[PDB]
Chain A
């Protein structure tokens, strides 16, 4: 029956600031003994979840005091103050009073910083891959912020659609920036048929869109 609503799903915030996450339950969860079993966990990329807060406001063993939880009955809150790189990850509230126990939907906390332009690069397919009848052209967008960025591929000036995929790294631990790779996949025959391959980047860190290219020649 019980439902755990955690918001916001995503939450940007800059260094030193305060982040607050909410968690509501469709139904009260306090025990007769006065104990409220509402917890807060942090899961950093590639790691297992780690306990932060237990029984609404108790702070676990290796947790800096910047973190603190509060709340009553059906409304609970987690407040982080003076954020910093480390704090990056996904936070979850969890109700352990009722069975089945349940996790909130999660909150991805990201570090917001000063706009940075990406350094752009393009890579032609290796002769080695062409033998297989496939040509992958790669465009790399390095160290930029915000995450938002658009990448268009142009082959002999003609815009491409439906044959590229993008992949984004996690916010760098040091500088808080992202990196992105866009791969355009064509058949060998199609690649040999054209000459100019260009990667055009649009980002709120570039006055006018940057373009990198090469000639199959």
Chain B
């Protein structure tokens, strides 16, 4: 029943500040050391520091990469763990996780919260259909999809036919283009003999800019 839920992450201008929180339940909070770990997209996990338990006056420790800038603290009456991040840099962009230091380790982890540091503004994505061209090889299955281009910051979510269509679906990881915006494509397989008779819709959801688009992928 041990649970940790984080919140507080988002987009923040460089040199700015943000406070991450991790609300816990299911165990005696004051009994444990609590830690913060981060993971930049595509990289290895990095320990950031811990805050001790009651028997140690809740003192703190930090990694060399955040000492002086990040402050860890805890509200024992509400059993909430915090991470105050100041003078934020671009290399601070990553998914932050809190962990309870039980079982002689870090045994229960939060679900993580994303932090993006950058001056770029919230921009919605353009959504284009990917449809087989006039030349459709005499095979069996036909592919189709959606191009979700030039949006910022991450992430975007895509589904097909309101979740109805799931098998053979592939939504690729987003890549950063020559400029600074992201883009990704989602595709799905289907029977060549079906493209026309049926309707395929890709549902693109991009919370960071309150966008929710349903692109009908016509032949």
Which residues of A approach B to under 8 Å, CB–CB? 35, 37, 39, 41, 43, 48-51, 54-55, 58, 60, 90, 92, 94, 96, 99-103, 105-106, 119, 121-126, 128-129, 132, 136, 138, 140, 142, 165, 167-169, 179, 181, 183, 185, 212-215, 217
Contacts and interface: CB of A to CB of B under 8 A. Distances in A.
Interface residues of B, number: 49
A59 B199 CA distance: 50
Contacts of A215: 134-135
A25 to B, nearest CB: 14
A54 B103 contact: yes
Nearest to B173: A167
B105 A48 contact: no
5 contacts: A41-B106, A96-B104, A123-B131, A167-B184, A169-B173
A106 B132 CA distance: 41
A115 to B, nearest CB: 20
A98 to B, nearest CB: 11
Contacts, number: 131
Nearest to B47: A101
A122 to B, nearest CB: 7
Contacts of B164: none
Contacts of A185: 177
A25 B104 CA distance: 19
Given A60-B103, A60-B107, A129 B173 contact: no
With most chain A CB atoms within 10 A of its CB, the pick from B133, B134, B137, B175 is B133
B104 A123 contact: no
A123 to B, nearest CB: 4
Given A51-B105, A119-B141, A168-B173, A100 B133 contact: no
Query: Chain A interface secondary structure, helix, strand, loop or mixed?
Result: strand
B172 A92 contact: no
Contact of A169 (B45, B99, B170, B189): B170
A169 B168 CA distance: 12
A163 B31 CA distance: 56
A101 B99 CA distance: 14
A89 to B, nearest CB: 12
Contacts of A48: 97, 109-112
Interface string B178-210: 000001110101000000000000000000000
Interface string B104-122: 1111011110000000000
Nearest to A170: B173
